[PDB]
């Protein structure tokens, strides 16, 4: 779960914000699933985003 | 004195190289046992060997 093969969606950072405006660090991730695709003949199991399969 | 080393062939080159290396062996044995009045001849032989080797490199491209 590191990138996607066709787009580039990867992980980044964000903030939590809790009702008094305190801020801590945080991780944001893309929605990656392992799929078999035909990239030059032989199938491969790669991580692909659900937005590029849509 | 390369003007003479350029008056020879690549066989007599290797021959004089053998001769001068042997001279160095004998000089080195003189200097240790208390002989060799003329110590400036050790440098001269080193430099004649150097000259033969450069000239042989130059001619074989």
């Amino acid at each position: 779960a590191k990138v996607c093969y066709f787009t580039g969606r990867k992980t980044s950072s964000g903030n939590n914000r809790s009702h008094a405006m305190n801020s801590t660090k945080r991780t944001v991730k893309p929605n990656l699933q392992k799929v078999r695709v035909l990239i030059d003949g032989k199938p491969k199991k790669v991580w692909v985003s659900a937005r590029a399969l849509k | 004195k390369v003007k003479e080393i350029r008056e020879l062939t690549t066989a007599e080159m290797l021959d004089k190289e053998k001769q001068l290396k042997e001279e160095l062996f004998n000089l080195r044995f003189q200097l240790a046992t208390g002989q060799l009045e003329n110590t400036a001849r050790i440098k001269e032989v080193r430099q004649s060997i150097a000259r033969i080797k450069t000239v042989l490199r130059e001619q074989a491209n």
Partner: protein
């Protein structure tokens, strides 16, 4: 290279006694074999050799003028003959 291998003879009081049993001491090259020295000696004098022995010598701290540092390393080989002789002086 058979003519850069032997450097020179050793002439000390422990080495004069060896010349009376047919043994000769030379400072030889570092990176030389027992066998390579044997070949070189048989080539440069036309003798027949029994038994090279070989040693390494450590450098010595010296200190001349408020500047200190070591002498060279050394290799010493002692060559025994069957029957023949070399005349060094």
């Amino acid at each position: 290279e058979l003519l850069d291998v032997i450097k020179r003879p050793v002439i000390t009081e422990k080495s004069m006694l060896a010349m009376d049993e047919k043994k000769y001491t030379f400072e030889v090259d570092t990176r030389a074999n027992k066998t390579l020295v044997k070949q070189a000696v048989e080539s440069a004098f036309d003798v027949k050799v029994a038994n090279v022995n070989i040693l390494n010598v450590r450098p010595k701290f010296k200190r001349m003028g408020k500047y200190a540092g070591y002498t060279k390393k050394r290799r010493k080989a002692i060559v025994t003959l069957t029957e023949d002789s070399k005349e060094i002086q």
